[PDB]
Swiss-Prot record, chains A, B:
Biological process, per Gene Ontology: endothelial cell differentiation; endothelial cell migration; hematopoietic stem cell homeostasis; negative regulation of apoptotic process
Oligomer and partners: Homodimer. Interacts with SCN10A. Interacts with DIP2A; DIP2A may act as a cell surface receptor for FSTL1. Interacts with BMP4. Interacts with CD14; this interaction promotes TL4-mediated signaling cascade.
Keywords recorded for this protein, A-Z: Disulfide bond, Glycoprotein, Heparin-binding, Phosphoprotein, Repeat, Secreted, Signal
Protein's name in the database: Follistatin-related protein 1
Locations listed in the record: Secreted
Tissue: During central nervous system development, strongly expressed in the telencephalon, diencephalon, brainstem, limbic system and spinal cord. Widely expressed in all organs.
Kazal-like domain span: 29-81
GO molecular function per UniProt: calcium ion binding; heparin binding
Organism (species): Mus musculus
Gene: Fstl1
Length: 81, 81
């Protein structure tokens, strides 16, 4: 009855955005990388250089992207102690 | 047990993005407007200058934003005929 929603797959092929970032469409109709809106909540805990434990790989880098800081995974699973 | 996800509300207050656009965070940690990822699927049909019928106000402008074209609502409800 009404027009069915358009996709960004076309504008966002084949775009590479790092971990914690994904591809979206600017007001000019062209692809950018921005911080990921919501990470898929797979349970895959991870420990950051910042000493924090994150739910998964995406969440660690998404946080890095929101804060403009330098977080990386140093080891997987929860942080020590 | 793990750190709970951060929000963009802080970076995106108080940002104004037009219809069909919303606010997200760039790789530099600052707010932009980009095309809305998914419009809330409220049923509020609308007819565009482009002669197409859209599910709602957001969907018409989101399409405008993805195509870089000049769509506006000329009247609400489905298009004629």
């Amino acid at each position: 009855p009404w027009e069915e929603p358009r996709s960004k797959s076309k504008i966002c092929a084949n775009v590479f955005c790092g971990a914690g970032r994904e591809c979206a469409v600017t007001e000019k109709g062209e692809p950018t990388c921005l911080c990921i809106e919501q990470c898929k909540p797979h349970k895959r805990p991870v420990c950051g250089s910042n000493g924090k434990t994150y739910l998964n790989h995406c969440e660690l880098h998404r946080d890095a992207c929101l804060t403009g800081s330098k977080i990386q995974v140093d080891y997987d699973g929860h942080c020590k102690e």
